[PDB]
Write a protein that binds this DNA or RNA. Sequence first.
RNA 1: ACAAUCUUCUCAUGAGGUGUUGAACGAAAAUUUAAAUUUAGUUUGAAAUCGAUUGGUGAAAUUUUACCACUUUGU
Lengths: 163, 184, 46, 137, 247
Amino acid sequence: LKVPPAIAQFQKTLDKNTATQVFKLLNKYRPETAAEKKQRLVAEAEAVANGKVSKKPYNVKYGLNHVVALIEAKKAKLVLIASDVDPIELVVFLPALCKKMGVPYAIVKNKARLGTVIHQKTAAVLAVTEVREEDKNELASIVSAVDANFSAKYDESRRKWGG
Amino acid sequence: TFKRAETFINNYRQRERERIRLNRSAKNKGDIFVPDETKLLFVIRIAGVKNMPPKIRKVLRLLRLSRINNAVFVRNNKAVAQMLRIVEPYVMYGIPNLHSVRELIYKRGFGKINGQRIALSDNALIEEALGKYDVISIEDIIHEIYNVGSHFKEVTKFLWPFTLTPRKAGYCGEEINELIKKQV
Amino acid sequence: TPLSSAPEPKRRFAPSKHEQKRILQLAYAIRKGRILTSEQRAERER
Amino acid sequence: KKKGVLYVGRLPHGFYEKQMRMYFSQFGPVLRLRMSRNRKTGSSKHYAFIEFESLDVANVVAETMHNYLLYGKLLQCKVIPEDQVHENMFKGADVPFKRIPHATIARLQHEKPLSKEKADKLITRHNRKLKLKKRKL
Amino acid sequence: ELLGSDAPLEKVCSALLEYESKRKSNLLEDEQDDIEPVWLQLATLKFIGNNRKLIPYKIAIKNPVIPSSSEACLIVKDPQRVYKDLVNEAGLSKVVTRVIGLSKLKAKWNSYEQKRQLRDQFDIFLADDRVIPMLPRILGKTFYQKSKVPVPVKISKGTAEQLKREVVSAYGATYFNSAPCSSFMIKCGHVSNTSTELAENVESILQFVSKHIVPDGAKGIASIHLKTSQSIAIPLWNNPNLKELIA
RNA sequence: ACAAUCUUCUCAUGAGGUGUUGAACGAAAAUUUAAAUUUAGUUUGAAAUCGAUUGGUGAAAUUUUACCACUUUGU
């Protein structure tokens, strides 16, 4: 058949170098594991039991409903969509929603790579909303690359029927 | 394989980093640390990074570190310190305790007689090659190397760059024995 | 502009009450000895 | 067939003539390599002109290596058409930049005493410099 | 006197100030207390510096050149909280706007855009002696070329009255970056200061110059001139016996 | 391997600390000996379409230094 433009736009993913750079920044903001989080809580629990303030965390945002609500909140600075969601309808609107709400987005390879970042088997989509001040330049540099290598590229190919 | 552009820049940054440290430590910082507690060390090579500064390249060769992990009996004094400090980012220097040198000589001892790895298994080999050097056995080799005897330089030449394949880029002291214990 | 005009809750500007609930019930087990403390567990591994 | 000249801009610091030559050689032959360098200290002006043996391969490198996120810099690799290419656009290509230490050379000049007559010429010149301000004030 | 028994101070400062004042010829939202600086250029018979020493010279003088209303930024070693507490109890918060730890300066300010933003924010950058060798990097030409050289202010012990004495010392003392040359220029003050202070600020500079930068002192000094950014370099003193010194 | 050693001070009481993206605009002074340095200043995206300074020094085996800088390149 002839793939519609909204479904063909997923075949033109993000390239080697930019994806590797994107995942390098994501891996500095991975969420905290279930095994580690318990250790952090029992450390704080033991501190309060013997005798007795912290800072807000900084981790990448995941979850389809959570991220879509972050795009519509104009909070997400970068949205990374898996290219192989089994029901494609789950993300078929995400590129158009990101275009409408002025968010930089990219379609990257494999849900597992996004899944690995957040200690899950699979992640449909990932969003970066806030980064540490030390890495504001790195996120800004990556977003520029996504604009140049994903949004500036293709562009016309996402409006043409695929296949 | 296809080398990516970042590797070439990474080589330049390390080179400039390597060049800088060499310029500071050598020129206007002629002061040296002068390692002590022995007259003999067991310097090993951590990793000679590719495209060394041309100064570096012989410092491995002359003090016998041409290959990685090459543990050698070097006469511990002020003279080796500046040269070692030239190559200190790629080496670990440490003291060959008598047990470590004996254990190395007993099993891993492959003395570079005629430039080839000649095993120190037979005490006659030490006795015959180092008869004028007073080293007569593997135990006498430790006396001539670990205790740095009168002919330690000749014994070291008789000895080999023992590849103590496993490390900090500097002082080890007894830690060379720790690597030797695992290596041998 | 954002899509929702719902006011921001205070909870997002404060330390989480989820872990505060979890910390308090971890403390209770530490007090009652149900949970081996980090020092006791670490020294038990030796 | 016709030489394919590649303008590589926004060069990350370190990606210099030797480094460009090894990297760009994998795509295709680089007849000669020229990077713009500063007037005095010869520091990179971050854009180089890389003419390949043929336009075709240079087009491949231009496509492959455009907007390359390198060391936090978006690399700009454009095939410059020959019409804007001039005779000395690749002048002194693959020729080492012997940075002349102008500052120390004048320091050696400072260390070098003038000839006694030429030193007296300086003293009179300072006297000229002294009397030039004389009617100046 | 002083240099070669012929330094005509006082009168030269008054004459230069009068000459500058003679050259006098909406902006209410574009006005401040800026006064044209006073410039002292020194000529030496030989290149004093081997290379650019990117630290200022603490030329002590009791007539400040930097106005006391200027904003100062302290660059201190870790932890940042300790010295943030120190400036809090010493009452220097109004004077010293920000205190920046070295790690936070190396991380939060990496782009040149951020570096220039920080540079324009404050006027004088005070730095602890304990970490001043780093500031060559991390800051770069955005600072050491656009007249923003951090000053090594001695705060190692970290006490309230010590902070006050060093900040006052830093504010009052004029500053200059040594570079390899036979000539260099010194900040003496502004047109606002009276001529007597400039002459006395000037003489304090030469005696410091003859001591800690010029090795042979007044013997190696070629000439002394007084200038304003748009004025004539009026010669304070010229060497009367430099003929055989250079021979 | 887009990872590496650019400086928590040092001595001595003084001296040092070896270190700055490029490009554009701009004073007006000095010495050094027009270029050479300093030299009011500046502006900007780690910005980028020729313009090169053009000698020396070694330091390997004359081409090689893409910083080797006169204190001037393989212990």
